[PDB]
């Protein structure tokens, strides 16, 4: 393919073969067993780019005890909001001081284009900064009007020990969307990144240490899903599990956590529509459609995976979309020109292709792609577009998590809302229209937590994120995330004595 | 042994003659179960008197109620009405509650075994819960962010959760329905309310009041029956968006587990083992009254009960003396008597469970100072006011929720010890601190891990403030402005006015 | 000329028989001025009909009212009541407003010259204002700061400002009282209400309804009289904490300067020159109706009037044709007729001033398309619906607030031009944008410097949202949650539990 | 008096004069006329330590014009919250980087002990940091429940151009309590510091320039009260005046501002009481009373200028207070050991002594101090009166010197009535270990800035301002942003409304 950029396994940066340790109670540690996991660069076949411990259940429980002691006995929850804030600002500063190093790690472990990784690192420094600024102003309420003899207080307090589990598609970003709100709320944390992508999360805990946030406030453990996931969800000393990843894994940890009334925060998958009306800015919308589906090679929960297009502009929109799709640079994650990088693993690329196969067998019309590219060099899947998709097809309903767009048409705004909502998911949606009523009413009527008008993907630390329906529980970011990691205590204070019950 | 503060029930009372029959309310219609099967409620206060009958719903009966709520949410006017419109209808329900206060109070008394004077006050409180919620429902807001770039506007829109299943317990039927329903429907939600098999009368009447007020069909449905199938159905049905459960930790955890299978939102309000901490500098007469109130309110069948007394050494004797004086005199017994302050146990199984905890406390070596037996066995279900002393944290009576009129007393020396003892529980619903000292009262209350706290008071709260638990006592916050967030979804919208900068470049 | 849309006053209407003598209300008592002097109101719709009389207060009469509010606040129970207690009393007032709706609507119609159907809708809206405020009054909060050191607790307490003097205009007497009084007394304040010399009847009735509801003596007092002495007394008296004035910029600025002499808080809601901007892509029929409504509502005697039409060149003729068709047909005249949409000028002095502006517009070279004279001169005070075209922004009719049914039309080519024209005013009260385009509707409204904005609508607002002006149109915000902050003080408390670190070593 | 630290005439830092210029539209400039004003350092022999321009009315109008253009046409208000915030954090960093330079200027110009000044500058860096964090999170409301065809928006916008006038007693702190909340809201500013104490304010504007804040966002002009005061209150291009200083000057500016409906924020004087109950921590309270009245030599609006003591701890308290009063190092502002600095001017030092003599002739009991001290420097001895009664001038009027008025009370109810018998309502402290006494007494005092078992020390997190004649509006915390914002209510109809004409 003309737009494919082949990698160069001779890149000097591939010779750095970083080895990492877990960080538990301030100390960098191996697994008791000494076992390790290697990460092979998905963009560069056979090139080992990271190794970290494979934790046992007991290794993870030690991380929990460190977080527990840090919360029960340590200074962190006792400090002022301002003191907590100053330390978190130092982490934000260190993230920028190490931007190049951190972006390289993400690119190599995830297969993320390096330019995209570099931008994500800077956005993470901004997340830490936002949260640091808000951490000191966290408040509760006074009720000075419940009777002269009484005063009502609602006090904000930390939930306690939070286990945070993060996925392979946006490792650093997801840690930075969770950890700062949790510890900023006065919580202590055990972070468990994906077995594929633990490098930047270990570095992040090491930066917090260098900052230096007290021992055991921010711990990181590494390993496969099974030990760590079960442990954090059932350990008595963990007060909350904040999970980000698939519905399948989310619901399992959710069921486990419910056994002991553990608070649960879930950010899960979706099948996000972009609705393009006939009066949209056609060039802006076409570019947004491509961005929505190809960003992170479509390995994105807020991907625009369904394109719902009004009948009258379907042809003009498809033409512009295919043109972008044929020209957009994909391949080598280390090339500064690359816009779309590698699939995370062979099993995942296989999953994506199997949906492309089901699409074809369903009768949907393949317009572009639908095959692996540069198979010898690494894991790459072609930009893929289906037309003629109907709502019943498995490709219109299930989350593919690859660069695969399903196109459906509609005639009226009412039909478009009905199609957008005919999903068990409810994470994201975009509406493209220049019409005040169409844009606002459509967005108001779609059951999705993360919405956009005349845009896609790009958000701000200032606004809350989360899903409706099966795409999640709770709300992160903005001021909302602090409520996720806080308990609220209602206090009825009687000054003097109450009226007696026994007369 | 007969106690002179026991008010014997009168089998003769005319109010027992009325054998009230009730129907479910689904999509505006009063309906029997498909099967025609019913459950009777015998008054716990008055042996053998049936005082209520209602349908035994099947799973399909419940799914039909879910379907009605689903339709009212997806196609009906309720979530598309203005907050003001919803608010006016909810005020009309509040006014109807007041209008029917004596009728409602009598039902609650007969079905729960609640003293009639307490039930009367509760019904008044419920009208107030409805009024508070109605006034707040129209003011519910989200946020604008007008500072995220000239080309962009940030919106956070508040919307309803959708269809909410609400399961309420036997101890405060009308109150808990009034703490949940108005916040859920005020947020634009529609509801299927499932009250306890023992105590469905006032909850059916509440749904009939909403219909009488003009609330659209399917917004507020009520089904009746045993714990299951309703519990399972609400937790598993794909058309239910959220389950709001109030009851035991045991049942709550199980419904939570089921609900998690489909990523269902869950609100839980569960049991506790609430401590009241009395310092040496407390107002002794007020504290002693508060201790009695704390444990005997609702016959101790109360999630926020003061079931543990933690008393500073050496006000111990002076507090105990006052507590025992009150406990000897306080009127318990016949729910229909206006003088009764403490009523009946909900059921024979429950009364045996309470007595089993008492016997366990004895075998543990705790000192029984008062009570510890059934009273008027032939007349109804009554348990004497009971006080244990010399309880140590390891005993089952110090740890487990008894849910009877049974106090466990433990002493401490220092504030720090009081805090450690208070937090030495898997529960965290409620706590009270009694002290005249600024630093002790406030630092102690700040350090206790419980969601519902009191200083120099106990039990009585306000619609204005949030309620909920820490640890195993609950998930989420109800009441005040908080309850509306429990029944809302928040939608974050990034609005580009014009066009974004192109990605392909 | 006789217009066929003019409804001539019917002097045989039996409602014109009603004579009404009102008294001031101070410290719970209905009272005359010490002098016995009174002021009559002649109906502006019906020549020679005397429809109300009320006292002409002396400076000393007003100080007595101030002293009653002072006593009510300093010693009486109102500010010490719970929010819930105040709320219940305010809901009773809202209920009374509805119970007396027809009575109140008639008073407003007769005294103001307001069409009876409009007056009736306003009274209903006022009942909703009182209900909204009553709902919110009980939930008012401050903040806790639990994160400023383990040894400290931060509290922000909300408290009432105290005694508030409220001065209201003749154009919307009941509405403005109802947008101010409930927010003030709901905050725990006590008030002295001073309505216009022309229109005191509904305001005295409102104070009488508060008394009837059981609001404590001295919480809500009303005095009547000319602009001064009342205005000067309220703005200079040491026992007044705040003046909330609504009326002309000239009077507000003067009261503002006087009040500043003693650091007295001031809320001002003043006049405007509000534009409606109609873009080529607007819904033309809707925009045309909204233009008519914007300028003719209350006979244009309205601070939020759309007194300037800024219309995009391409649709100027189509919009004008629709606007003039409505303007030829719309019923104006007899305020007592149910068909009337536009009523009387408030006074002969006001009608002359309105005509003075129209004559100035003609001399400036503006094109008179419609109206521009008095109608039914013998029967009452009526001014014809009036439209000017070809208005340029240097003309006195583009710049000054006319306060009659007189529209000034100017054209523009681009949104940027429309914004600059809209903002080329010293005023900043209201503005409307009509457009079907997302970007131009929202970007235009974000760029216009006015506090009360509308898209694709005009005039009609909600109690839920705040109101007030930019620039010379006002100071402060009323309504929604904002009005409570206007009548509250916030007390920041740094609480040290135990001992701070010593300053002296 | 052996607690006096005599000023060292030879300290070299007294010889290092500094000259400053105004800063307008990013440019450092002298007055059009070239005229300047000097400042003599009040703790020392007539040593000139600062000079800055004497502005004309036209100079101030140009500063307003620069702010106006910066707001109407420049990037500042159109920037995201995040972008403004990043620039404000850079100013916070610069303040810390220049801490010692700034502390010395404040010490030299106002007569403030250098250890106090050091802490103050540190605190100002924190004020800027807090404000910078909060600026990006400012929000309005959506009302999504006012009918299916409608959407309510409340949009927060900047008020526009703000004139900020600051006093001689805390020049850097008050600039740092106002400017960051104003520019953080999207506003542009013209700062006018006192003629006595312009040095740190000019440096602050230059730090903002150095940080990269756009030209015209933060301007600083210097000179006497007028013409700057009049111009800021009268210029139609100014949208708001934020004034801090005396009731007398505040009320006059407020009157002028009212003539054109100009928004005004006022932070004025006080007569703050500290209430000490019999159950208070005696040692902490005694130390608190001394702090309260002697901080900044009593030249403080939040001074505990009245002591209200419960009969029966009166004598044990008075003993502790006098012991402290006699040992506390006062004098040379340049000494690291000094706790109490110099008076501001000769005219002010004399005003303080005049109140002291008027307190003597009223019948009050002088227990300590009451004398001017020095020949080279303006100073006043720690002064404690007993037996003061509500009606005496020293009980009613703001002295603004290190002069305590002591009154006794029997009950909490009398303590409250005594605390509230003032036209002021800026601050109050309550000392008690009793839950009900501490909280009910604080709830009943009509004052905006309150303390329990503490005095003086506050946080950026919490709002400040006065009741009664002590001010209008609320600064700091989240409240200060509302002071510099306008709120725009929008009823948005999607599609079309129901027609009026049917
Ligand atoms: Ca007549």
TrEMBL record, chain A:
Keyword terms of this UniProt record: Calcium, Metal-binding, NADP, Oxidation, Oxidoreductase, Plasmid, Potassium
Similarity annotation: Belongs to the aldehyde dehydrogenase family.
Keyword Oxidoreductase: yes
SUPFAM superfamilies (alphabetical): ALDH-like (SSF53720)
Organism: Rhizobium meliloti (strain 1021)
Stretches of the chain forming a coiled coil according to its record: none
The protein, known as: NAD-dependent aldehyde dehydrogenase
Domain Aldehyde dehydrogenase: 31-490
From TrEMBL, chains B, C:
Keywords: Calcium, Metal-binding, NADP, Oxidation, Oxidoreductase, Plasmid, Potassium
Residues reported in the UniProt entry to bind Ca(2+): 16, 49
PANTHER family reported for this sequence: ALDEHYDE DEHYDROGENASE-RELATED (PTHR11699)
Molecular function terms from GO: metal ion binding; oxidoreductase activity, acting on the aldehyde or oxo group of donors, NAD or NADP as acceptor
Family to which the UniProt record says this protein belongs: Belongs to the aldehyde dehydrogenase family.
Pfam families associated with the record: Aldedh
Record Gene3D superfamilies: Aldehyde Dehydrogenase, Chain A, domain 1 (3.40.605.10), Aldehyde Dehydrogenase, Chain A, domain 2 (3.40.309.10)
InterPro entries in the cross-refs: Ald_DH/histidinol_DH, Ald_DH_C, Ald_DH_N, Aldehyde_DH_dom
Name of the protein described by the UniProt record: NAD-dependent aldehyde dehydrogenase
UniProt domain Aldehyde dehydrogenase: residue ranges: 33-492
């Amino acid at each position: 393919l003309s737009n494919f950029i082949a990698p160069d396994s001779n890149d000097p940066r591939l010779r750095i073969k970083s080895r990492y340790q877990m960080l538990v109670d301030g100390k960098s540690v191996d697994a008791a067993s000494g076992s390790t996991i290697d990460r092979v660069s998905p963009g560069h076949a056979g090139e080992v780019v990271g190794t970290w411990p494979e934790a046992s259940a007991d290794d993870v429980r030690k991380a929990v005890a460190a977080a527990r002691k840090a919360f029960d006995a340590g200074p962190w929850p006792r400090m002022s909001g301002a003191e907590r804030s100053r330390l978190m600002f130092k982490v934000a500063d260190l993230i920028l001081a190490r931007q190049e190093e951190l972006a390289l790690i993400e690119s190599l472990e995830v297969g993320k284009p390096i330019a995209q990784a570099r931008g994500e690192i800077g956005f993470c420094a901004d997340l830490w900064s936002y949260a640091a600024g808000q951490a000191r102003a966290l408040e509760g309420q006074t009720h000075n009007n419940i009777g002269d003899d009484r005063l009502g207080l609602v006090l904000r307090e930390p939930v306690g020990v939070v286990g945070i589990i993060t996925p392979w598609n946006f490792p650093f970003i997801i840690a930075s969307e969770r950890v700062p709100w949790a510890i900023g709320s006065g919580c202590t944390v055990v972070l468990k990144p994906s077995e594929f992508t633990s490098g930047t999360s270990i570095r992040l805990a090491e930066l917090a240490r260098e900052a230096g946030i007290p021992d055991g406030v921010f711990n990181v453990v590494t390993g496969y899903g099974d030990p760590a996931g079960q442990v954090l969800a059932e350990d008595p000393n963990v007060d909350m599990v904040a999970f980000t990843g698939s519905v399948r894994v989310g619901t399992k940890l959710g069921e486990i956590a419910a056994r002991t009334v553990k608070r649960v925060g879930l950010e899960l998958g979706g099948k996000g529509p972009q609705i393009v009306f006939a009066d949209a800015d056609l060039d802006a919308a076409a570019d947004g459609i491509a961005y929505g589906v190809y960003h992170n090679a479509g390995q994105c929960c807020i991907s625009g995976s369904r394109l719902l297009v009004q009948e009258g502009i379907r042809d003009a929109l498809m033409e512009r979309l295919l043109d972008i799709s044929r020209k957009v640079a994909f391949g080598d994650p280390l090339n500064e020109r690359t816009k779309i990088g590698a699939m995370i693993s062979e099993a995942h690329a296989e999953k994506v292709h199997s949906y492309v196969t089901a699409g074809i067998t369903s009768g949907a019309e393949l317009l572009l792609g639908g095959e692996r590219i540069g198979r010898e060099a690494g894991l790459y899947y072609a930009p893929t577009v289906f037309a003629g998709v109907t709502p019943d097809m498995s490709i219109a309903r299930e989350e593919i998590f690859g660069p695969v767009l399903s196109t459906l048409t509609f005639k009226t705004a009412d039909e478009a809302v009905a199609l957008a909502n005919a999903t068990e998911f409810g994470l994201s949606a975009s509406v493209w229209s220049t019409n005040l009523e169409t844009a606002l009413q459509t967005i108001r009527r779609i059951r999705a937590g993360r919405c956009w008008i005349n845009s896609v993907i790009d958000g701000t630390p200032e606004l809350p994120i989360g899903g409706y329906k099966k795409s999640g529980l709770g709300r992160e970011l903005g001021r909302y995330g602090f409520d996720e990691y806080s308990q609220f205590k209602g206090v009825h204070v009687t000054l003097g004595r109450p009226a007696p019950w026994f007369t």
